[PDB]
Amino acid sequence: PAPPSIWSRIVNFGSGWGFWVSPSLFITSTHVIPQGTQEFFGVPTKQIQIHKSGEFCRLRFPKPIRTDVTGMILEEGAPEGTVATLLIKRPTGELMPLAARMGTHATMKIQGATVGGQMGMLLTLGTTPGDCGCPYIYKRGNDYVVIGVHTAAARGGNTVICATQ
Ligand SMILES: CCOC(=O)CC[C@H](C[C@@H]1CCNC1=O)NC(=O)[C@@H](CC(=O)[C@@H](NC(=O)c1cc(C)on1)C(C)C)Cc1ccc(F)cc1
């Protein structure tokens, strides 16, 4: 499960979703970002500072946009064995948190491409196309930590991939 504040940060972004780590820090997947728009949330792309590390896409805006959200902790993956939660929203509005025991951090070969991220293993419906960009989060003490965004889900198994950095 997750609090309603963490869920509010997830917003539709092109083919998938994106997560407001802070009023001005927006993370998403490289596969889902729209490649034809010169504006994001009314802010010109010329003012936005984008840094991409594989399928992890980082958007820094000049001004704060979502002043309602507190700034969370963003880190490169979670300790091996950490049971994280994949907060995937669906178009219908249904909320579908999935429990995923994170695993090895590594550079992977996904469909002939190279992706830095962390493997995960879903526990006990599943992920689908249009889910990339949704965040992985786990609770550390009393603080919430986001570790990456969804990127792929190997077929013939419950292996999921959490792009990082
Ligand atoms: C093209 C449409 O694009 C989208 O809509 C993005 C959403 C889907 C969501 C998947 C979709 C289903 N369940 C899910 O969670 N993502 C992808 O399709 C990715 C490919 C896979 O998931 C493949 N996985 C692996 O190759 C793979 C290999 C290992 C190892 O782990 N995963 C296939 C499962 C489709 C796209 C991709 C390609 C090359 C990369 F560098 C990085 C990413």
Numbering used by the authors: 0 to 123, 132 to 172
Task: Give me lines lifted from the publication on this model.
To understand the role of R112 in ligand interaction, we determined the crystal structures of the R112A mutant of GII-Pros complexed with rupintrivir as well as enzyme and inhibition kinetics. Surprisingly, there is little change in backbone conformation between the respective rupintrivir-bound WT and R112A proteases of all GII strains. The BII-CII loops in the R112A protease structures adopt an open conformation even without the R112A sidechain present, with the conformation of the rupintrivir pose remaining the same as in GII.4-Pro Sydney and GII.3-Pro WT structures. In GII.4-Pro HOV R112A, the rupintrivir-bound protease backbone shows the moderately open BII-CII loop position seen in rupintrivir-bound protease structures from other GI and GII strains, indicating that this is the most stable rupintrivir-bound conformation for HuNoV proteases. These highly similar backbones between WT and R112A mutant proteases, especially in the BII-CII loop, further confirm that the main cause for the lower potency of inhibitors against GII-Pro is the steric clash and subsequent unfavorable interaction of the P2, P3, and P4 residues with the BII-CII loop, rather than steric hindrance by the R112 sidechain alone. In addition, we observed increasing substrate affinity (decreasing Michaelis constant, KM) for all proteases, except for GII.3, which already has the lowest Michaelis constant. In addition, except in the case of GII.3-Pro, there was a reduction in the Michaelis constant (KM). Our structures of GII R112A proteases in complex with rupintrivir further show no significant changes in the protease backbone between rupintrivir-bound WT and R112A proteases. These results suggest that the differential placement of R112 in GII-Pros is not solely responsible for the observed potency difference.
